[model samples]
Target: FQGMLEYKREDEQKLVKNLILELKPRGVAVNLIPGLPAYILFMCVRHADYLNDDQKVRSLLTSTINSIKKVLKKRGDDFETVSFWLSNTCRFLHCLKQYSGEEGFMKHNTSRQNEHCLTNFDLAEYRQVLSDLAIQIYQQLVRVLENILQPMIVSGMLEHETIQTYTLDSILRQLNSFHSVMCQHGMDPELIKQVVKQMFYIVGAITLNNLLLRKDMCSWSKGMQIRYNVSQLEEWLRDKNLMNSGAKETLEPLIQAAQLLQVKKKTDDDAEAICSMCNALTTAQIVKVLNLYTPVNEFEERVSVSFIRTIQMRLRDRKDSPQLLMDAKHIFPVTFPFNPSSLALETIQIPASLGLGFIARV
Candidate 1:
């Protein structure tokens, strides 16, 4: 019996040592003696020299908080009753507070002197937290807008409704309210600004796409069709009933696109406008609108060459016609060249020029 008792005590000693080893890194674990966990927490807080490294300090602080949270989850109301647990918890928290000061605990080591070591600004963790929160907000915004726009899509509002009616007044108002509430609750203002800008661009693209769908080019004259499209887009800026308060902010590029599409008289102004429009649109949007009024690529190149040739022919007979030549230089292309390659070769190598300027006069 005496030998059995001695062996039993030895086993208990070994068990306690193992528990301490496990709990040391974990902050706190369940099903342990109250004093044992408390003792570990005090030891971790008091022996700051042992965890001199910023990473070590971070690890211990995080583990302690995690353990506190876990214990609170299981026995929240009676957590304070645990023997020495509350006092040790407060001491650990205090230690963390001291480390978080302007000059952090690990600042003595120049290698670990960084923003992450600062108690107030754990920038990595802070940025990630903000990103996660922003993602949630963005996801919710997408869902809400999708639900609202789904019915319009089914009804073909793009074809039937005008640009003014497709505005997002109610949606913007709701978002503003949400932004105010989030700001009140300590969300980052700069992040909200970025989100708002992104929302504006997305909504602007949707609005422009819908406007393009409203166009019916088949029955209209080329010039008239362009005019109609421009008017439709411009109406969003002018019509009080349909105009959004912030319409000007996002609609300028789309309006410019409409103006660029108008090429009634092939002139320098018209060419400039077309180039401006091409710059405004992405490759995909440009492709869809390319042949709306004319075979754009063929028409542009041919007309440009014809305009230049016509001026050159006029100059041969009238060398003093600088105004006419200037006008021709600026003239936009009106029609597609019938055969650009053959025309180019012939113009550059006129047949009569073979011996005209040569020294083979012998």
Candidate 2:
């Protein structure tokens, strides 16, 4: 089962757009390779034309090898590159689940742009392009994250003001610098070379607070915080030694860091519940170990509040890194699924309120 795609650019683009848009944000992996492969699986099951009694869900698997092989073949055996591509797939799944809602799951066409759907015809038209787009966005996001991690892991430098104020200014400035680079090296440039880089500026444009700066409020970064409920922590602690032995060596460093911060052991009922989980640990503990990282709490109202109390507290009396403002802009979470059925390709909207972009509340 192999075929060659001799379709025109416009026709191909139209099909790809239909397939990608129909899925909205979910089912869209961070990379094109995984998405297409997954799509192939879907088609194989949905379209069993080889059997006269089966339905014809449109076949793109057999001959479509020519189209995808070129793109995939370009990737070498390098571990980092492969890891980035794989991680992008995970990130896509995460974003899809986080941002997409149940509003556009069915077939419908309304004034609302968030609503999307994909049928057999739609999937046939744009899968290739959509595949390309997913990889594009993943790369862009990785580049930005790489830049952020560098200062924390390699540079190990902080502003004197950051140590004193715990303000968003220092982080904001770094984000702005990285964003500027992203703006210049965009999908437009990649288009010429046939490399897609989607969602960098779009996600980066998210606001940090009231400011229009592109900084935090994402599942990653200091914008969002994840605390393991008390019960989860207990579970992890119970098997902590065993888990540490089985898991990566990195866990040891993290545990040592938490102990250094003297994060008081919370033994409340809720805390105990979270601890009951196999690998339960609070976002607070993780943050403290990661050099006083702040947790971004998503309130019931859908607002992400980044509390700088710890960061600011340390900076208030320190002479090394003093940051003034200790808050990040909050935004509502919005999600759209790309596959409609698959658990990937979901794009979650990061609010401009938290230095990303301003979109209506979810």
Candidate 3:
């Protein structure tokens, strides 16, 4: 019968193992630990290094990943499930890099920060593991994100001849719901920006495709209508602080398509204005939209081949994307930036709900 003193190290290590294996990730915000699982696991990891037990960190690290993988596997269908893990995994990876005692993240340190540095481990291998884990989670989250919103993008952004941005209201509200979820639930803002950008690209691609296919939608009034709707969408992006996230740029081709319908299609100067103004549109797209341009009245004739010929001559040397329609499923490259947190590791307190009650503030 050994006393607590004899089993001290083993007890703590076993507790660490249990905690990782049983980690329960949930949505996080106000008054709660910002990145709960990541913060707690890093505490265990740091304590291992602090106590000079080199072997435990790897076991704990591997346990942490496999357990997270299990959580992802079980709840893979839930958006909340995958998104929360992605956020925490990045935080976990960031903690390792920041405290690795290497100059890479050391440049950002100051809090007698030497105290926070890990002294006993080669962790780059695990960092790569966490990095790959993050990427898989990111991919899953984006897939969920797309299916959630894709159902609405086509008809929502492309319909609405009755006006008032009616079709777009639910779309905007759905986006707002998404925005609040990612922001409040601890997702990295950079990832949010990337996700928002990809989402907008889909909206643009789908709306433009629908507009191109429907001759009924290619009228001057519809152009003005789309231009007005796009203006509000652009305004929404700016308000959300995502103006620089390539969202606006993705919408440009659709915006140019709208302008193509509204602008004059008659003269040399008109063709020139179209050529210059439509820098976002491909030659095939411009030609296609012009061919489909619905005149305002019965007397109004379709665009002359001579006008298209002239435009073609001016663009004779250019070749960018000749595809008439942008691939709606095209994914923008995703990036995960390392934005380290400034909070002191010692000051971190694991919440009781996570079953780490064995740990005390002292």
Segments of candidate 2 deviating more than 4 angstroms = 1-108, 111-122, 152-161, 164-168, 176-259, 263-336, 339-362
> Which candidate has the highest TM-score of all?
3
Better model by lDDT: candidate 2 vs candidate 3: 3
lDDT of 1 at 52: 44
TM-score of 3: 0.87
Error of 1 at 338 (Å): 63
Clashing pairs for model 1 are 100-119, 266-332
Q: Write the per-residue lDDT of candidate 3 for residues 1-362, one digit (tens) a residue.
A: 10001113445555644454444444232226657667667766776776676666666787688878877888777786677778888988988888888887888887556567777886899999899988888888777877877788656666655374336888788778878777766788999998889878878888898777878778887788788878888888989989888888888999999989888888999989998999988899998888888776665568999999998888888875877977888878787888787767665655555555555443
The local lDDT score (0 to 100) that residue 335 gets in candidate 2 is 22
Better of 1 and 3 by TM-score: 3
lDDT of each: 0.34, 0.29, 0.76
Return whichever of 1 and 2 wins on TM-score. 1
* Model 1, global lDDT: 0.34
- 1-362 in candidate 2: lDDT tens per residue? 12111222224333333333222222323232334433322323222322322123333332232333333345423223333333333333322322233344333323232332221233332344435544543454445454443343211111112222322344335434443333332222222111111112122122111111121212222221111111222243244232222222223322332232223223343233323321322334333333332334343122112322333333343233222221212111212134233232223322222221211112
